[PDB]
Amino acid sequence: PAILNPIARPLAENIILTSLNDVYDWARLSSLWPLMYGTACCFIEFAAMIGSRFDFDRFGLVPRNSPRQADLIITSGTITMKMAPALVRLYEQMPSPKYVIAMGACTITGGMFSSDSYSAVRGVDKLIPVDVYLPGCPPRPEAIMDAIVKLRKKIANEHINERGNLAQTHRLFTAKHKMKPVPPILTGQYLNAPSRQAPP
Amino acid sequence: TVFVLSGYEYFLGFLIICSLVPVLALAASALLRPKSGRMIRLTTYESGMEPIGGAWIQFNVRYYMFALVFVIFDVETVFLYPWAVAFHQLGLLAFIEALIFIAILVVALVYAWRKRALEWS
Amino acid sequence: VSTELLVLGVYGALAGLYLLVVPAIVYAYLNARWYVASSFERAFMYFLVTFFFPGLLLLAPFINFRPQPRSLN
Amino acid sequence: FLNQITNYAKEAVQSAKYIGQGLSVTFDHMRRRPITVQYPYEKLIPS
Amino acid sequence: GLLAGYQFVKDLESAGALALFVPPEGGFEGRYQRRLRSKGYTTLPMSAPGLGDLAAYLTQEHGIRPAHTGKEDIRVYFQPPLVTYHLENLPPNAKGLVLWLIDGKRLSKQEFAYLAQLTQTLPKFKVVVEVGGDRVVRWEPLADWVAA
Amino acid sequence: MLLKSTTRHVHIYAGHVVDGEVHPDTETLTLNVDPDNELEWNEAALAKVEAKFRELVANAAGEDLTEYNLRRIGSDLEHFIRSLLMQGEIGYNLNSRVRNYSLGIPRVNH
Amino acid sequence: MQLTYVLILAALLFCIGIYGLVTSRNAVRVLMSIELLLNAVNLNLIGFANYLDGQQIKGQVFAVFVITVAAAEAAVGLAIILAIYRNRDTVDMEKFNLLKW
Amino acid sequence: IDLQGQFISALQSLGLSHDLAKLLWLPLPMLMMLIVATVGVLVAVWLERKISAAVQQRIGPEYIGPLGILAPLADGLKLIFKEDVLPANSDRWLFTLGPAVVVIPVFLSYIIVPFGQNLLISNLAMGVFLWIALSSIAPIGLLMAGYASNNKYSLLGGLRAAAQSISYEIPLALAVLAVAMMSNGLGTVEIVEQQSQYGILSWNVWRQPIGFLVFWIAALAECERLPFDLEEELVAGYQTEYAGMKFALFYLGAYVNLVLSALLVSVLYFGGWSFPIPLETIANLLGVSETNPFLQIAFAVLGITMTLIKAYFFVFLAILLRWTVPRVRIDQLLDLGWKFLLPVGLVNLLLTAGLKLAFPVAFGG
Numbered sequence A: 001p002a003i004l005n006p007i008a009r010p011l012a013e014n015i016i017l018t019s020l021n022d023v024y025d026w027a028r029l030s031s032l033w034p035l036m037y038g039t040a041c042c043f044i045e046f047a048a049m050i051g052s053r054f055d056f057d058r059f060g061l062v063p064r065n066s067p068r069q070a071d072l073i074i075t076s077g078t079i080t081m082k083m084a085p086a087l088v089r090l091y092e093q094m095p096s097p098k099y100v101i102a103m104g105a106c107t108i109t110g111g112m113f114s115s116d117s118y119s120a121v122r123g124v125d126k127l128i129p130v131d132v133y134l135p136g137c138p139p140r141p142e143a144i145m146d147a148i149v150k151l152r153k154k155i156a157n158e159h160i161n162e163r164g165n166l167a168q169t170h171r172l173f174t175a176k177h178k179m180k181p182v183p184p185i186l187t188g189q190y191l192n193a194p195s196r197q198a199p200p
Numbered sequence B: 001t002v003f004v005l006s007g008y009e010y011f012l013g014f015l016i017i018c019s020l021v022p023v024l025a026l027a028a029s030a031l032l033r034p035k036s037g038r039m040i041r042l043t044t045y046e047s048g049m050e051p052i053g054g055a056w057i058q059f060n061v062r063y064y065m066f067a068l069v070f071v072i073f074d075v076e077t078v079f080l081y082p083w084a085v086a087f088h089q090l091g092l093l094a095f096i097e098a099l100i101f102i103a104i105l106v107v108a109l110v111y112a113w114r115k116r117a118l119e120w121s
Numbered sequence C: 001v002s003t004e005l006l007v008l009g010v011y012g013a014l015a016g017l018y019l020l021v022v023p024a025i026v027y028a029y030l031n032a033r034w035y036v037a038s039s040f041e042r043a044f045m046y047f048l049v050t051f052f053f054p055g056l057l058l059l060a061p062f063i064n065f066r067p068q069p070r071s072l073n
Numbered sequence D: 001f002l003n004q005i006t007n008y009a010k011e012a013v014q015s016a017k018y019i020g021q022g023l024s025v026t027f028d029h030m031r032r033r034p035i036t037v038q039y040p041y042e043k044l045i046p047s
Numbered sequence E: 001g002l003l004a005g006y007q008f009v010k011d012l013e014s015a016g017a018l019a020l021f022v023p024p025e026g027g028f029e030g031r032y033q034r035r036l037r038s039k040g041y042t043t044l045p046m047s048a049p050g051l052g053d054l055a056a057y058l059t060q061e062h063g064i065r066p067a068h069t070g071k072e073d074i075r076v077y078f079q080p081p082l083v084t085y086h087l088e089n090l091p092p093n094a095k096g097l098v099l100w101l102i103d104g105k106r107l108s109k110q111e112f113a114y115l116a117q118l119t120q121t122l123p124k125f126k127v128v129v130e131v132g133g134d135r136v137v138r139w140e141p142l143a144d145w146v147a148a
Numbered sequence F: 001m002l003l004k005s006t007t008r009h010v011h012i013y014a015g016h017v018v019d020g021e022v023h024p025d026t027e028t029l030t031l032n033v034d035p036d037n038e039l040e041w042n043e044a045a046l047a048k049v050e051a052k053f054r055e056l057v058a059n060a061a062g063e064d065l066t067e068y069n070l071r072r073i074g075s076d077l078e079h080f081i082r083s084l085l086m087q088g089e090i091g092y093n094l095n096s097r098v099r100n101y102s103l104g105i106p107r108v109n110h
Numbered sequence G: 001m002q003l004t005y006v007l008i009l010a011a012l013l014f015c016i017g018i019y020g021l022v023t024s025r026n027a028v029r030v031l032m033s034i035e036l037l038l039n040a041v042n043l044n045l046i047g048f049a050n051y052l053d054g055q056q057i058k059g060q061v062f063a064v065f066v067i068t069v070a071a072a073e074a075a076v077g078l079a080i081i082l083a084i085y086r087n088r089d090t091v092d093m094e095k096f097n098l099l100k101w
Numbered sequence H: 001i002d003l004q005g006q007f008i009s010a011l012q013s014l015g016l017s018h019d020l021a022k023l024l025w026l027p028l029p030m031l032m033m034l035i036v037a038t039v040g041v042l043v044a045v046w047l048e049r050k051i052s053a054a055v056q057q058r059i060g061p062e063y064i065g066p067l068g069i070l071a072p073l074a075d076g077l078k079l080i081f082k083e084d085v086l087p088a089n090s091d092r093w094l095f096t097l098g099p100a101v102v103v104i105p106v107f108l109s110y111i112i113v114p115f116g117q118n119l120l121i122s123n124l125a126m127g128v129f130l131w132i133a134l135s136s137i138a139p140i141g142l143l144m145a146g147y148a149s150n151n152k153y154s155l156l157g158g159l160r161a162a163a164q165s166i167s168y169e170i171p172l173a174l175a176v177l178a179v180a181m182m183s184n185g186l187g188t189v190e191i192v193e194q195q196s197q198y199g200i201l202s203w204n205v206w207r208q209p210i211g212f213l214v215f216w217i218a219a220l221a222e223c224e225r226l227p228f229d230l231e232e233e234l235v236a237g238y239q240t241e242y243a244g245m246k247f248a249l250f251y252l253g254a255y256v257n258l259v260l261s262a263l264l265v266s267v268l269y270f271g272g273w274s275f276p277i278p279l280e281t282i283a284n285l286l287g288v289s290e291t292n293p294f295l296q297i298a299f300a301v302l303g304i305t306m307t308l309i310k311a312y313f314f315v316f317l318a319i320l321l322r323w324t325v326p327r328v329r330i331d332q333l334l335d336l337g338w339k340f341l342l343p344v345g346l347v348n349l350l351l352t353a354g355l356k357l358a359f360p361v362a363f364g365g
């Protein structure tokens, strides 16, 4: 074939619909409600922008702890594979017009934990579709604002007639297995344990 | 009989206008949806994991006791309304009997305050 | 000429003053001072933004507030 | 029994004075100018 | 606001390369980038600081060296030209292509004339370069920016 | 306990989709291939992926139901998807909102 | 608008409250139909004070007293009900067959 | 002057039947008050954001308009465009109509607040009843949305918020009763007329100083300013389950309740449409003021301006005292409420009745 990994190949509009699309894009550009998710010092670098020195609030972004009223998630920090289904569920529980900004060197790629590591996830793009990458270990908060500016330049590229892309197809398949039933995992049972007070 | 009062068409019209708008806003939000509803994988809100504990609430009494003292004092406030309305030419015996009423309900409040009738420990 | 025409003229002049000539000087003075004003003057500026808000809703997307470039040698 | 009532009244007037002092320092904090910078209009100088 | 019409498309079809001045506080070139797709042009986002050489990446093939950690040996990846392979399996209607550079501030004026000659050699793709801008949205010819 | 392991393309759920939700059941494993618009698919390569999934679920027999073995099955499935992409088959599509090459870049053989 | 339709509506609400007092499939719906049974007589007293009475109104006073009485009876009935869930495990009325002859 | 009488006379000169002509006159002010209420909500959101920025020494939302005033409008226009998500449960119509049951009566209670002698909707007898009994409905919608929420923590947070909301209804009624005893009436027109008879010396803030503080504390506890019930036992009390539309409805409903409380506190205690100098002396000093509307229009504008500066002052004081006093627990809040606002409110009503029965000269008689 001589070409590895090939790419498959894939008009008059109105002025009032164009102005309505400009208003619809300007509303998403003006609100831009983020989500604060951080497990390391990148969360401290994000919280340094919320303080009254860089004024991250002035672009319209307000801090929310809810992964349901945020049209943008900001993953940050060294990601363990035990936290990867947690991040997948936190991304899936968000509404459909969502965006991903990945901040950090260990987030967008393996980072420093890419030579001798067995638990760190080498890249968040294997988990969630990253729109704007952000290299840096740790990046400047001005670079985070530059990534916000590039995300705002990327949001206005969307269309109101080509809105039929924010969905997931079914492609269901049903098969059986022959695995053995597992005993359950511990839920509590730390202080009032029969092997704790009574010495064996 | 005849229906003569100060007026009630404003209340009904404002109720109709204020009740027509939320379902209209919901219909507009359903019309200007990006694609549709009917999410393929429906999951409830847990913070970071799967539900491992249980869907049961501990049997408490603090909400029912608060609503009990609330309805007991609300039907007192309802009886306390027309005495304060009609206190323009009535007199002093009504004030004495309302003072007896207020003192009896204050004794009721002291009985509810002394024992464990409301305590969110 | 009658008194009702004078009342209509007073109403039109009041609507014009409420919509055009007050938010222009409000938008001028608000970013003209913006730092030297005290807390009472800041409350007065916030009240001036609060009161004539239908004028601000019509004069908001037309005006532009951006810093001017400087010269270099 | 009355000394507990006077101590509660002293704690209440002390809490009211603390609320008034908090309102005073909050009104004091409105006098100073904001110390933030604009981006990309006021960029910092790299050392 | 400002109800913009269809004027950037005519200026892009008349010349071969354009330079627009946008405010860097937010995003306003997305409206023209969406109007280009509404007119029937396929957009291609690309970053101007990381490009290497323009000739070896746009006309011929290049060799990328991935960062190895000593575990693997020294390998080379043969990268084809980007706009050529984007022009190969392009056309649904066969109207035109555009190339958008985001941060055009970190570039020299030597390769700009070569890019303006390359977009005039093959009449199938356009070149759109972004400058940090001064307080207003204005368009300028890139050849006039090179000559002056 | 809802056992699952998904990264971007494979979804191995240890339940059964009735209408739009799942229930905990250790007798049925549901497979979802490429839920996001990242690769365009067909009916023959998807059938080969399903046959490889049936072979991998027939290989794992006599083991306990844990997250490690299910994640290993999903990793072998994604390795089969990557080798099918490298074999000279279907790849990326130019119709999504974001274009990120997560598996590889198009290169030249010679 | 006549008094006869209001009396017919009050009688129909009284019969609905009687049926929801008898069957009810529960023990809280018994009290919920008791409130309907007293709201029917509240409608009866309000219509009687509207049509038959003139200046000196007293059926409205009786309706306010009946409303306060029914609120106290609802509080007493819920205090009775909330001990059964503490004592017994079930809430069905048909299981209470201990006190026989 | 009378715009309604002139409109009726013009429709009679055009030729109509005096019933359908008078039927359709009411929806134009009935929608005008609603659109100026949404205008005041968009004012109050920007005001709260910029004042919270100015307290913590920073700047609010910018780069959206001239100074970011379109940002509440942009938020309200964006939050209705989001995808309405639903959890894995039943009763979708109940989950939809729960916030509707919350939003209906607080919006409905706009027929009570006045702006002058003629600039109001309804003043029949008992507007304080139509405020209290309609504001006491929202716990039902809160418990309905908590039951349709299908969660262990959000339902408990909704139960805690409902128990917090229903406890502050009784001193909120007793502080209204303490003013309605002195005013010998339940309508707001007689209450504001007894204050606008004289100037500063007839205000109810100097006559009932404890009841004003009790009413203000009860309003700050009811509109959820000091009680943070939106860290609420896992993350939040009645949140983390809706979409942008229901959250926008709850946000606008909370701001409507805040605006309505900030208007009603000033109306019942301080008094909008009032001046320190009485209007009769100014009318006697200027000329003849009985039919000439050139000064009456300016007096109505001045009364609207006085009501607006009183509402803005109360809004600024509430959102300044939000971040001034620290956060207290909901148990300590219920304890301080039930141990302070009820006994001092009862003895305040008792001393009010005693002062009314002792010297009925300066009170309502």
Ligand SMILES: CCCCCCCCCCCCCCCCCC(=O)OC[C@H](CO[C@@H]1O[C@H](CO[C@H]2O[C@H](CO)[C@H](O)[C@H](O)[C@H]2O)[C@H](O)[C@H](O)[C@H]1O)OC(=O)CCCCCCCCCCCCCCCCC
Binding pocket: C004, C050, C051, C053, H001, H002, H003, H004, H005, H006, H007, H010, H028, H029, H032, H033, H036, H039, H040, H043, H044, H115, H117, H118, H119, H120, H121, H122, H259, H304, H308, H311, H312, H315
């Ligand atoms: C921090 C928070 C910030 C808050 C926000 C601040 C920013 C926003 C501030 C804006 C101001 C707030 C709103 C003002 C107060 C509300 C006034 C209102 O609702 O007020 C309601 C008013 C009605 O109020 C008064 O209503 C009167 C009728 O009252 C009657 O009806 C009333 C019930 O409506 C009462 O019951 C009253 O007792 C009873 O007498 C008359 O109509 C008065 O003129 C009128 O002032 O609605 C109207 O203004 C009428 C509606 C428009 C109709 C158009 C007029 C019709 C066209 C006539 C054209 C005539 C053409 C022929 C000319 C002849 C040529 C020869």
Ligand SMILES: CCCCCCCCCCCCCCCCCC(=O)OC[C@H](CO[C@@H]1O[C@H](CO[C@H]2O[C@H](CO)[C@H](O)[C@H](O)[C@H]2O)[C@H](O)[C@H](O)[C@H]1O)OC(=O)CCCCCCCCCCCCCCCCC
Binding pocket: C011, C014, C015, C017, C018, C058, H001, H002, H003, H115, H116, H117, H118, H119, H273, H279, H296, H297, H298, H299, H300, H301, H303, H304
């Ligand atoms: C591109 C889009 C264009 C949009 C076009 C829309 C244009 C039309 C809308 C423009 C509105 C703004 C123009 C201002 C009109 C104000 C007229 C006014 O107040 O008219 C006054 C009349 C007076 O009403 C009459 O007033 C009489 C005299 O009473 C007055 O005087 C008495 C004195 O004791 C009492 O105090 C009494 O309470 C008080 O109302 C009686 O009350 C009568 O019942 C009543 O008919 O009100 C009336 O009819 C009711 C009038 C309702 C107006 C409410 C609007 C809020 C007022 C604007 C805010 C003030 C801003 C002023 C800015 C100036 C800054 C320096």
Ligand SMILES: CCCCCCCCCCCCCCCC(=O)OC[C@H](CO[C@@H]1O[C@H](CS(=O)(=O)O)[C@@H](O)[C@H](O)[C@H]1O)OC(=O)CCCCCCCCCCCCCCC
Binding pocket: A019, A022, A023, A026, B028, C060, C061, C062, C063, C064, C065, E001, E002, E023, E028, E031, E136, E137, H064, H065, H066, H070, H077
């Ligand atoms: C013949 C005259 C006709 C006048 C028509 C007036 C129409 C007014 C509304 C404008 C509508 C079109 C806006 C296009 C958006 C855009 O691209 O950005 C235009 C500007 C960009 O900034 C602005 O941009 C300008 C230029 S630039 O982009 O910065 O370079 C700059 O000058 C300015 O400072 C800056 O603010 O954004 C805005 O701030 C304008 C906000 C307009 C939004 C109005 C809200 C509508 C509410 C009603 C909704 C009804 C539908 C309800 C659905 C349920």
Ligand SMILES: CCCCCCCCCCCCCCCC(=O)OC[C@H](COP(=O)(O)OC[C@@H](O)CO)OC(=O)CCCCCCCCCCCCCCC
Binding pocket: B003, B004, B005, B007, B008, B009, B011, B012, B013, B015, B016, B017, H022, H023, H024, H027, H031
């Ligand atoms: C933007 C457009 C939106 C649409 C416009 C809205 C139209 C709405 C009103 C129509 C205008 C014409 C009719 C009004 C004009 C009109 O004709 O009314 C006038 C009419 C009688 O008024 P008067 O007695 O003043 O009029 C006659 C006098 O002039 C002399 O006798 O008023 C009533 O009948 C009041 C009715 C209230 C009835 C009691 C209230 C019932 C409330 C029930 C609450 C239920 C809660 C249920 C919960 C489940």
Ligand SMILES: CCCCCCCCCCCCCCCC(=O)OC[C@H](COP(=O)(O)OC[C@@H](O)CO)OC(=O)CCCCCCCCCCCCCCC
Binding pocket: D011, D012, D013, D015, D016, D019, D020, H213, H216, H217, H220, H226, H321, H325, H328, H332, H336, H340
């Ligand atoms: C011009 C109008 C100015 C009006 C401003 C008044 C609004 C302020 C209301 C306070 C809201 C917050 C309540 C939280 C209060 C709070 O959280 O702490 C309340 C605090 C509780 O203390 P503890 O928890 O120790 O008490 C309970 C324990 O003792 C259990 O045993 O004490 C009170 O009970 C006393 C209340 C006095 C409250 C005084 C309030 C008024 C202070 C300002 C007086 C101004 C005079 C101005 C003169 C110009």
Ligand SMILES: CC1=C(/C=C/C(C)=C/C=C/C(C)=C/C=C/C=C(C)/C=C/C=C(C)/C=C/C2=C(C)CCCC2(C)C)C(C)(C)CCC1
Binding pocket: C040, C043, C044, C047, C051, D023, D024, D027, H302, H305, H309, H312, H313, H316, H317, H320
């Ligand atoms: C004639 C007229 C006019 C005028 C106006 C005016 C003149 C106004 C002003 C006024 C004002 C300007 C007001 C405001 C105010 C506000 C404020 C200022 C508030 C705040 C404060 C606070 C809340 C505080 C507190 C406290 C306390 C209580 C204690 C002690 C301490 C303190 C003091 C901190 C106009 C042009 C409009 C038009 C129409 C007509």
Ligand code: SF4
Binding pocket: A040, A041, A042, A076, A077, A078, A104, A105, A106, A107, A111, A136, A137, A138, A139
């Ligand atoms: S990129 Fe650097 S700063 Fe960020 S999480 Fe990794 S080690 Fe920490």
